[PDB]
Copies of this chain bind each other. A is one copy, B any other.
């Protein structure tokens, strides 16, 4: 499998999930269908999303790691799947939630070759490959502002911070693409409970990187060895190469 193949499968997935959720009225979406592989309720809308995805997906030679259903298959391309990040927002009709996909030639983030984040609410498509990061077919890169007086996404502000704006939309993959686009100058999930999972962060991280962003663990450690088919925890510090050290200092 290559990137184009990856781009082709993701768009196919994007359309199906898009359709399944779009149909489901809020009061259906909100219902607990079961206990997720993640340890949190699997709501009716996450069930349809993950279903749609997994039907296109498992016709591939992939080992998939998905939010609700765990580790699936044994193929040697790993897919970090988030069938619907922003669940809370979709169950109440707030237009920020996506399907996020990250393909790797190993069970390690450092071998990622393709990243994909589709805005299920607005139909906004992001992805990055060996040619660059994109939004709705147009190239994108991170902003170049290096003052901490900036536009930050942040989970969570523990204290008084210097930011210009602080925002929390509730969708780690999409917010990372909000960082990738330059819409926001940084992204931070610095909660001492390292709560992010590999599939919520996988592609946005990848994509954040092709658009120029520097992205690391809390202490600036590399995200290269974060694993898939293991239950990985992530904290993220993501900014251009310039603001990046200052943030690192800022929370230290």
Q: Interface on A for B, CB 8 Å cutoff?
A: 88, 92-96, 121-122, 124, 151, 156-161, 165-170, 178, 181, 183
Contact = CB atoms under 8 A, between A and B. Distances in A.
15 contacts: A88-B151, A93-B183, A94-B183, A95-B95, A95-B121, A95-B122, A121-B122, A157-B157, A157-B158, A158-B159, A158-B160, A159-B159, A165-B170, A166-B168, A168-B168
A97 to B, nearest CB: 11
User: Closest 9 A-B residue pairs measured CB to CB?
Assistant: A95-B95, A92-B183, A157-B157, A168-B168, A167-B168, A95-B122, A158-B160, A167-B170, A156-B166
Contact of A88 (B122, B158, B165): B165
Nearest to A174: B94
Contacts of A161: 156
Contact of A178 (B94, B122, B165): B94
Contacts of A183: 92-94
Contacts of A159: 158-159
Contacts of A151: 88
Contacts of A178: 92, 94
A41 to B, nearest CB: 13
Given A92-B183, A122-B95, A158-B160, A169 B167 contact: yes
A122 B93 contact: yes
A119 to B, nearest CB: 8
A95 B96 contact: yes
A83 B95 CA distance: 20
A165 B151 CA distance: 21
Contacts of A165: 88, 170
Contacts of A124: 93
A170 B124 CA distance: 19
A161 B155 CA distance: 12
Nearest to A170: B167
Given A93-B124, A160-B158, A169 B169 contact: yes
Given A92-B181, A158-B160, A167-B168, 11 more contacts: A92-B183, A95-B96, A95-B122, A96-B169, A121-B122, A157-B157, A157-B158, A158-B159, A165-B170, A166-B168, A167-B170
